[PDB]
Amino acid sequence: SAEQVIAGFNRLRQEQRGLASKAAELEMELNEHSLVIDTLKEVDETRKCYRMVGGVLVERTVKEVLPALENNKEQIQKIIETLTQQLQAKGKELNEFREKHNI
Amino acid sequence: VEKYQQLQKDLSKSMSGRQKLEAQLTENNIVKEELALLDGSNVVFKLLGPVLVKQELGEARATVGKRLDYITAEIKRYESQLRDLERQSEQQRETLAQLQQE
Amino acid sequence: VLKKLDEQYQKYKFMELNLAQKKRRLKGQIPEIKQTLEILKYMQKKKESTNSMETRFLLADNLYCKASVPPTDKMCLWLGANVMLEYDIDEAQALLEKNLSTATKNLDSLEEDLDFLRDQFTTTEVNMARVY
Amino acid sequence: AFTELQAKVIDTQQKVKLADIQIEQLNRTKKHAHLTDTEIMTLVDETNMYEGVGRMFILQSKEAIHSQLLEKQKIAEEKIKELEQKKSYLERSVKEAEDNIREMLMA
Amino acid sequence: GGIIEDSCVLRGVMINKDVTHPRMRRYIKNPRIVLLDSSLEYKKGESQTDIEITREEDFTRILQMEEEYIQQLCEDIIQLKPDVVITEKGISDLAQHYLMRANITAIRRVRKTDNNRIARACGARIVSRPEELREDDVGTGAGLLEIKKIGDEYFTFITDCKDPKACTILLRGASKEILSEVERNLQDAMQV
Amino acid sequence: NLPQLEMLKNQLDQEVEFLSTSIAQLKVVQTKYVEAKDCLNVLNKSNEGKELLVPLTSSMYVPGKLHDVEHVLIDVGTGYYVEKTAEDAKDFFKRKIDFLTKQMEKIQPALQEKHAMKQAVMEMMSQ
Amino acid sequence: DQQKINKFARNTSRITELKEEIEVKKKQLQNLEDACDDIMLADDDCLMIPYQIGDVFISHSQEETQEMLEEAKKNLQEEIDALESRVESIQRVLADLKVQLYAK
Amino acid sequence: APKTDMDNQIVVSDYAQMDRVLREERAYILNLVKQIKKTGCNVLLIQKSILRDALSDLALHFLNKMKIMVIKDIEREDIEFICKTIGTKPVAHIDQFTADMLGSAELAEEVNLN
């Protein structure tokens, strides 16, 4: 009847509204990786480049310090999509259980 | 009812940094120590304002004595608004409780 | 349909404010790194050591060290994500100008994401409200 | 009475929980303080190498750093076991009162 | 439940009071019902107590320091072969868990007269030096411990008493009234 | 029975988190105490004259030349700076751990009992 | 959605936006006065006066501090008033977005 | 300096105002004291602080920290006895700080003993 109609009307809406949840959620994750490379890769790396660790500021060169920002940036960007889709599929399932209570 | 909770924020407002004082109050005893512990071995500074003020023991001696006293002084301003806010929210509690029950 | 207008009425105004605050975090990282310009540009010096001044060196939170600082002309800039380089006063100048704008547009980007999320939610809602 | 028997199982419960999460990064900060040494061992020698205990990077010879930083390896190298010593007994201690809960019930 | 007909003595003291349910096994014949009396609290030093648990390895080291002295106290109990052990107040969870390591139930935080009932039930004594323990101290004779549901409640019977017998009045009423009417006149006899 | 313990359960969880939130954050304030001590440790360890890369401002850092080891801060008083002796500051770098650890650590058993007070309500709320 | 209401909210959005960067700058200017006061509190002229920028504290007389302190004020104050007439202009359209909302 | 909730005058909302009005309060009790040592005093007769409205410790600290020996907590009638018998003329004011109104003692000591 009207109980299943609201469920898909919820889940696509959960997907619909969750389009905002994943919008804000993975944003700053992308943002930090870029500003780093955006600031690093733009400015001259040509001379010696610090490997920066809290207790140890390592002296290295560009060849070492530059590629570290490229690879795991893309690697993290691959992984971050999963948890939100989980949270949204959870948001899909959880709210699918919630509208079902009060009839 | 909001009447129960109404004046408690204004209350804890004046209580908030007053608590922060009471650690400073404790460390005001310690700066009295660490001023007395400093004969000038290493520089003494009241840090007040974004400018570092070069300072002295006797300049900070009354001061830390004045601070500790003053760091006891923001206690009484809350002690003013302590029984202001907790007492009138104590009357308010019955006011809109029954009206909303009514 | 009565469902289109209100779902357009609700979300669009609802997101109109959402377009402001993501523009308010457009400018959130602006003044933060903007004050960094001054702290550099004051201490920027030529003909003498960059920041030749007196100092209490900040080693830690509870800790400082008095001294004459004066270095060469250089600044070691943190660009984030475990990468530092050693820049001189100008690379320090310009690369610091960058943490302004590229940080400015970090969560600036989520505004026009919420621009059409303002738009797309109602349209998908009303058509699904027809599915309803 | 099972109250302190239920009380001891709660306290030693959250006692042991810390030794698990720390011990692995202690191996890491062991391994990384080897690596950060290897990281400066990457470039054979430099004066612009820094090792420091704070916001200060106090300019240090990478050699004394190699010592200090393998020493910094040895710092986190040791802390794994004293946790594992924490990890060892506290796991059993929470069940000590639990052993008292259940027997008296089985009794 | 029961009825003054089937109301009849068991030796020592039949323990109703703290028993709404078995805390001491179910039925114990040879194994010794054992009174552990205060003085089961830890010693972090030899006879002493040092600083207690604070941070990581004190949880280990100190609560271990607590445990050995008690494990040392524990052994002397298990050495006399108990299974049930009734420990009145002054119990360590340290004192029980090795009694648990011997799978010998250590019954904690139970009243004095009750233990004196139990010190009259198997007629053992109350331990005056819990650091050096004897089966002559607690769990004397062969002893018995039997926790029986009669009507509603499990009833610990610590029996086969040493001390010159000992015997307590089993009072079984159908209700507690038909129980009580007897006991009140019974109270005349037991006084006479 | 149940609804009053549905109502009373509200505050006890906060009393949990009141104590849960507070104790965790004082280790952060202890971080600087050993830090500054350690920052003063390696400070005295090497010498005066080492280059000091010190925070200029965010996204940047500034170098510097260390001319004073024995010149070392303590923060006590109110807004106040006491530059202390290398051992003095260390002692307070040390000692400021000691008092703060006391106020910090006392919070953990009270954390449990607020839950033991909440958990007791949970049961009687469910029972 | 109703036209004015989107503009109303977008204008109600901007009204707050503009007085934001107005108000944040008062207490700093005020602290710049307080900073002028604090050097003036103790060690007025009687010693070196350093001034804190970054990690270095520039040694000089008393008045150079307050001069720099008074300096950032008016600068920061012009920053205050820069969005002031911008608050003026924004809500005058909002009141219209109030007027034309009930009018339409 | 003037009171609200202490010798430190405290307007109560947020703690920077009451921190800054110190610059008001602190300087005065210092200068009011600095004024005490301007004319100068070896002993200060100070009657009881309840024979006062109140006496700033902030001052009184920096007061004795300019090294003037003082007796506080003395009866004004003592002072009245003292204003006459040793001729220390009553001082209600810093204009009234004067070598005449500031009595001349041959010797002034304290004995905790005997």
Which tokens hold the place of B12? 């804890």
User: Can you spell out the DSSP letters for G61-92?
Assistant: -HHHHHHHHHHHHHHHHHHHHHTHHHHHHHHH
Q: Rg of chain D's alpha carbons, rounded to an integer?
A: 22
Q: CA Rg, chain F, in Å?
A: 23
**How far, in Å, CA of A38 to CA of A18, rounded?**
29
Amino acid at E125: R
Strands C54-57 and E10-11: unpaired
Residue C77: name the closest of C89, C97, C92 by CA. Answer: C92
Query: What are the φ and ψ backbone dihedral angles of E82, each rounded to 5 degrees?
Result: -90, 175
d(CA A69, CA A36): 8
The whole-angstrom distance between residue E167's C-alpha and the CA centroid of its chain comes to 17
Half-sphere CA count of E65, side-chain side, radius 13 A:
16
- Tell me the residue type at B62: A
Do E and D touch, counting CB pairs below 8 Å (3 needed)? yes
**Nearest-angstrom CA–CA distance, E150 and E179:** 13
CA atoms within 13 A on the CB side of F6: 5
Q: Tell me the helix, strand and coil percentages in chain G, rounded to 5.
A: 75, 10, 15
Cα atoms in the 13 Å half-sphere on the side-chain side of H65: 21
- Helix F86-105 and helix F107-126, axial crossing angle in degrees, nearest 10: 20
Count of Cβ atoms closer than 10 Å to residue A55 Cβ? 20
In the DSSP assignment, the letter for residue E135 is: T
Q: How was this structure determined?
A: cryo-EM
Backbone interruptions in chain G following residues (C to N > 2.5 Å) = none
Whether chain H has a CB inside 8 Å of the CB on B99: the answer is no
CB contact under 8 A, G55 and C57: yes
Number of residues that this document lists for chain D: 107
DSSP string, chain E: ---TTT---EESEEE-TT-SS-SS-SEESSSBP-EE-S--S--SSSSS------SHHHHHHHHHHHHHHHHHHHHHHHHT-BSEEEE-SS--HHHHHHHHHTT-EEE-S--HHHHHHHHHHT-----S-TTS--TTTSS-SS-EEEEEEETTEEEEEEES--SS--EE-----SSSHHHHHHHHHHHHHHH-
Distance (Å) from the alpha carbon of C105 to chain G's nearest alpha carbon:
17
Q: What is the C-alpha R_g of chain B?
A: 21
* Data resolution in angstroms: 8.5
Tell me whether strands E35-36 and E84-87 are parallel, antiparallel or unpaired.
parallel
Do C95 and A53 count as a contact with CB atoms less than 8 A apart?
no
Extract the tokens encoding C122: 């109602």
Q: Which of E89, E46, E83, E75 is nearest to E133 (CA)?
A: E75
Please give the Cα distance from D97 to H81 (Å, whole number). Answer: 77
Mark yes or no for CB contact D11/F42 under 8 Å.
no
Residue D18: count of CB within 10 angstroms of its CB: 16
Q: Under DSSP, is residue C85 helix (H, G, I), strand (E, B) or coil? A: strand
Interface test with D, best of E25, E63, E85, E115 (most D CBs within 10 A): E63
Identify any residues that bridge with E146 across adjacent strands, giving them in sequence order: E27, E157
Interchain proximity D95–E97, CB inside 8 Å: yes
Q: Which residue has the tokens 């920052």?
A: F39
Q: Please give the DSSP secondary-structure letter assigned to residue F68.
A: -
Nearest to D51 by CA among C17, F50, A6: F50
Distance separating alpha carbons of residues F82 and F76, to the nearest angstrom: 7
Structure tokens at E175: 């209700």
Per-residue buried b or exposed e for C117-126, using 16+ beta carbons within 10 Å of the residue's own CB: bbeebbebbb
Q: With an 8 Å Cβ cutoff, are F80 and B67 in contact?
A: yes
Q: Please judge whether G1 and C57 are an interchain contact, meaning their C-beta atoms are less than 8 angstroms apart.
A: no
Measure the CA–CA gap between G96 and D41, rounded to whole angstroms.
70
Q: Which of E94, E100, E69 is nearest to E82 (CA)?
A: E100
Give the DSSP H/E element, type plus range, for residue G53.
Answer: strand G49-53
Burial D68-91 (b: 16+ CB within 10 A, else e): bbbebbebbbebbebbebbbebbe
Contact status, residue B8 vs residue B64, Cβ threshold 8 Å? no
State whether F55 and G54 contact (CB < 8 Å): yes
Could you tell me the two tokens for H54?
């109140």
Tally the C-alpha atoms within 13 A of residue A85's C-alpha that lie toward its C-beta: 5
Backbone angle region of F25, left / alpha / beta, with phi > 0 → left and psi within -120 to 50 → alpha: alpha
Q: Taking each helix axis as running N to C, give the angle between helix A67-98 and helix A2-25, from 0 to 180 degrees, rounded to the nearest 10.
A: 160
Strands (DSSP E) found in E26-152 = 27-28, 35-36, 84-87, 105-107, 144-150
d(CA B79, CA B83): 7
Enter the DSSP assignment of B47.
B
Hey, what's the torsion of the CAs at G89, G90, G95, G98, to 10 degrees?
160
C vs F, Cβ pairs < 8 A, gives 135
Contact by Cβ (8 Å): B95, B3: yes
- C66 vs B43: CB contact, 8 Å cut-off? yes
Distances (CA, A) of D75 to D68, D79, D81, D83, F91: 10, 7, 11, 13, 22
Asked whether the beta carbons of H45 and H82 are under 8 A apart, the reply is yes
CA-to-CA dists, residue C121 to A16, A99, C10, C117, angstroms: 6, 19, 10, 6
CB atoms inside a 10 Å sphere around CB E61: 18
Residue A60 has its nearest CB partner, among D42, D52, D57, at D42
Contact present, B21 and B71 (Cβ < 8 Å): yes
As a whole number of angstroms, the distance between CA D83 and CA E57 comes to: 7
* Nearest residue in H to G39, CA atom: H23
For H25, nearest residue in chain G (alpha carbons): G41
Q: Are strands E27-28 and E144-150 parallel, antiparallel or unpaired?
A: antiparallel
- Quote the tokens at residue F106: 């006392």
Residue contact H23–G38, C-beta within 8 A: yes
**What is the maximal distance between C-alpha atoms in chain A?**
71
Q: Taking Cα atoms as reference points, which of H104, H48, H99, H39 lies closest to residue H66?
A: H39
Is the CB of residue G11 less than 8 Å from the CB of residue G94? yes
DSSP code of residue E122: T
Mutate to test the interface with C, among A50, A57, A64 (most CBs of C within 10 A): A50
Residues of F with CB under 8 A from a CB of D: 35-36, 38-39, 41-43, 46, 50-55, 66, 108-109, 112, 116
Is F73 at the interface with chain C, CB within 8 A?
yes
**Euclidean distance between CA atoms E111 and E115, whole angstroms:** 6
Residue A67 DSSP class: H
Count other Cβ atoms within 10 Å, centred on residue E103: 12
Closest CA to F33 of F83, F99, F102, F80: F99
